[PDB]
Each structure stands twice: as structure tokens, then as C-alpha cells.
DNA sequence: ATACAGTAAATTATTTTTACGGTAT
DNA sequence: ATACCGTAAAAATAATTTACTGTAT
């Protein structure tokens, strides 16, 4: 029942203990502008209400250390949680290389191309299940032209932002890149579409990612370890309309021609799945 | 002079106004566990102490909306700022697809390979400028073997974690994948090497990214708009030891053979720089 | 009718300030 | 003597509770 701010301090305690091996009040002080006394109380609150006696004061290292059986209770055990805490405390989302703390660098992709006036209109249309008229341009049709769309979900792929939307002139659900929308979209009064009919969005498929069959056995074991594969594969369930983005996010080879460079593409989509993958040209708006 | 908690609430007010066009106390209440009265007090504090009169209550849309003259004062106009705020409230870093709120999906890459005990030791060695003995394996030598390293920086490329470190067996600074480090790294008493000698780390270069020249003029203008090019190019200054990771992060073609697929690679490293890498 | 809106006064809870401690090393 | 630690008691600040409000659609 704790407020978000206290929760952030509990998370910070847990992540510092778990990932750095050491926790001192001063770090929480530097992060939250707190007194040593309240930070001490935060540590005690953690150690009694969240992770009972999970931390122990070790005067040898002049700070708190996790107990041998320490197991996080507010975060999952992967390192994204640690980076997320650090970057939320010292954000530099505009920079190419974030340096949230000393000795940590994180490659970023600053997006300055998505305009707020486009976002407010499109997100509101998403929430209202409303229909927009907008000016758009695609690779297939690169001069500005009108589109009539009923959007339902904004999507960040890890590289680009688009909105999943019903295209009324083609009568299909497609992806529209938000950076390609000129001016501000305007609401139009036409019968709206039910997003439940977006087959590709609601149907799932399982992609099987495997080590590049061109690598020798010791090399494939390294790929398995790199991606945490349980049994020589990554089975990835994903919405059909998001499969390609997921594959791109993993840097997977999806054509037999790509997989021939096992150095560039140690991770490959298993061949039987390739003929399953929908056409990518019809993902993008026409 | 405002507390960190208050600053986060001010940030949330600004970002909701700027990116959603509308702000109501109820959202702040759901986000921070506040009473409507305190959230109302936060809105007034923003509108008077941070961005004077930038917001106005519009009863027609049942909330506060930014004024036509609205200008953010606590955030940059990068949509990353909005997504980071949203995701900071609902931590689902484990999911393939995060849904920090309804009508928003975010493709993620959950990392399952980087171990905490490896991080504690290596981070401590970075801060102490100390020297570690560890068990490693690479694609070139995929049998497990010992390596002696002086690390200085952990690196997240957007796809993988590695540590930049002086490699004592090859007397070069190299990148070590953290997923290949066995959980038992050891501090050893060997002179550590000065990270100031990491030539690749401290030298910068300027990469020039351009629309794929195979695209026609109208398509190239779209690439320019997509990537925010001021004058038909993206000039990216970066540490040499991070250049390749940056190019991968942008999904840019870096070989003339890759640049032949203008659909897969609308963005390419300019030819003169390709021979530099 | 709904879902938004203002706030002051009183009560309550959160942090801060102050002081006087203990343990490696 | 550094560098970390506990934490009560008093004081200061922030937040909640209560109780009255108003408006476009
Ligand atoms: Cl650094
Ligand atoms: Cl971009």
C-alpha cells in the first residue's frame, strides 16, 4: 500500500544491494535529497516489511550487504531493472551515449521526429476509438496524401514509433509511422471500426530463434548462453502484427541469405518459421 | 529547492500536458498515491512556480490543457521522455511487449544472460581500477579459458552488455561480453593499467549517416524527416570504441553490399566513412 | 448526469534537525 | 579518523480529511 515515492526508494535499496553488493545511506541521499536519518529508516523499512532481514550491516565494508540467500522481491533478476533505476534518476534521454553513473555507458537512440501535436490527437483517437483524417507519406507513395484511419495502439519498436490503425481506403489494419504525419490530424464523423477485428494484432504466433546452423557446436553453446536459451532455442510468442519488429529487436537473420554470415547473425529464425512470417511490405501503410 | 518527489510530480504534469494535451488530478492520484487536493496543489504549483500560466482548466474537455504558447521547461521535446515516465510507473522489464498503459505497446529485449555476482565484482573493479582474473570464451576461441583484465566501463549497446577492459594477454583494450563471464571473477594482485591509455575509448570520430542514395528524391526527404536531419545528413560524433554499436543501434548500413537493399537500409553510413571503420 | 474543476481549516503523516551514541581499520 | 552505522525526541514540512464549491457536454 506504499506510495510510489517510497516504492522507488525500496526499489533503489533492492537494486543497489543486489547488483552492486553494497548499500550505504549516502547513495540514497544523493539520489533522493533525503536526510541520512530517513534513508536509514528506508533501509529498515525494506529489511522488515519487504525482504525480511535480507540485508545485513557489515562494518568490514562500511555499509549494508545482501545476505547469501538474497532474492529480490520488487524487481525481476535481470539487469534492465538496474539500468532503468539509474537512468530514471539521472536521465539523458536526448544523448547518444547515456552515462547515468561513473563506469556505465548506454547506447541510446534519441528520437526527435515524433511531434506532440500528432501524439495528443492520435492517442486521443486511440482512447475514443475515433477516426482521423491526416496527411501521410510512405516509401511506396512518398508525396503527401490523405489517409483516413481509426487507430487503436501506439507502438514503440525500439527504433521507431508507429500507430496500429484501420486504413479505410484499403480496408486493412496497417502500421502508420508517426514521424510521417504532416500537420495535425483532424477527427472525421464516420462509423468507427472495432479493434477486436484486427486479426494480426490479436492472433499470436511462436517464433523459434536458434543459433546459426553454420557455427560449430562450441560456438552454438555460446549463442545459447548469450540469449539464455533453455534447450538450443528461444521460443518467442508474440502478436502476429509485432513479429517482424520483435525479430528486428533481436537482430535475427530472417532470410537464408542473411544467415550465411554467421558472424553478423549468430541468431537465426528457424527455417520452417520463415514461410510462416507474414509479408513485411503490407505491414507498412501503402 | 524542491524535493525529488515533488520534481517527479512536476515532470509528470509537464509531460502529460505536452504529450497528451490534457491533464486531470485523477491521473496524478493513480500515479503517486495522492489525494485529489494535493494533486490539485501540484498542478497549481506547476502553473505558478515552474511554467507560469502555461496551463488552463478547459471545462469543455474536463481537464487542464496546455495553452497555445505552451513551452516545456523541465523536459526536452523527445518522446523518449514521455515513454520513460510511463514505464517508470509500471516496471515490466521482463516482458517481450511492455504495455505501460492501454493503447501503448513497446517492444523490449529482456536480458536474461547478465548475472548479478558478475556485475558486483566487475563494477567494483572498475571503480577501484583493480585487476580481475576471470573465465571467458569468445567466438574465435569458444573453449573456456582464463583472461586477466583491467576493466573501466560497463556498456549497454541496446542489445548486449559488455565491459570495456584492458586485456593483459593481448596487451590491448577490448570488449568483453558479460554473458560470457563466469560468476567467479577474482581480484588478483597485478599492476592495473591506466584507462587513460585506451586510445579507442577516448578518441572520437564523426560518422555521417545519409538517406540511401538508391532512393529517389522524395523518399530521401522522408528519411531526412524520420531521423531529424538538419541539412540532409546525420552527423554523429562518438567514441571510436562505440561507433559500431551506435551504427547498429540506428540499423544503418555500413557496407556497400548492405546499402544495396534500400528498403531494409533507408539509412546508410556515407561511403567516405565506410572505408574508415 | 457525468467527470472534471477550487481550496481552506483541521488533523495526520512524513522528513528534517539535533544529539549521542557503535564498529572496522 | 575515515567511513559507515542506529535512532529517539523535538521540530518542521508535506499530505490527508472534511466540507463546501462550479461548468461544458
Ligand atoms: Cl564512465
Ligand atoms: Cl529516430
Author numbering:
A (entry chain A): 3 to 288
B (entry chain B): 3 to 279
What text appears in the publication on this structure?
Bacteriophage exclusion (‘BREX’) phage restriction systems are found in a wide range of bacteria. Biochemical and crystallographic analyses of this factor, which we term BrxR (‘BREX Regulator’), demonstrate that it forms a homodimer and specifically binds a DNA target site upstream of its transcription start site. We demonstrate that BrxR is a sequence-specific DNA binding protein comprising wHTH, WYL and WCX domains, propose that the protein and its reading frame act respectively as trans and cis transcriptional regulators of the BREX system, and suggest that its function has been widely adopted in more divergent bacterial species to regulate defense systems. Bioinformatic analyses indicated that BrxR contains three domains: an N-terminal winged helix-turn-helix (wHTH) domain, a WYL domain and a ‘WYL C-terminal extension’ (‘WCX’) domain.
We next co-crystallized BrxR with this palindromic sequence and solved a second structure of BrxR bound to the DNA target at 2.3 Å resolution. The cocrystal structure illustrates that BrxR binds the DNA target through extensive interactions between each subunit's wHTH domain and each corresponding target half-site. The DNA duplex maintains a B-form topology and all the bases are found in Watson-Crick interactions with their partners from the opposing complementary strand. Overlay of the DNA-bound protein structure to the unbound form of BrxR shows a near perfect match in structure, indicating that the unbound form of BrxR is in the proper configuration for binding this sequence. Each protein subunit contributes an interface that buries ∼870 Å2 of surface area, via the formation direct and water-mediated atomic contacts to the DNA (analysis facilitated and visualized with the DNAProDB online tool). BrxR makes relatively few direct contacts to bases in each half-site of the DNA target. One residue in particular (R38) appears to be involved in direct recognition of two consecutive bases in each half-site (G:C and T:A at positions ±6 and 7). K64 also appears to make multiple direct contacts, albeit in the minor groove, contacting bases at position ±10 and 11. Beyond these direct contacts, the substantial bend in the DNA target likely contributes to specificity across the center of the target, by promoting the A:T rich sequence across those basepairs.
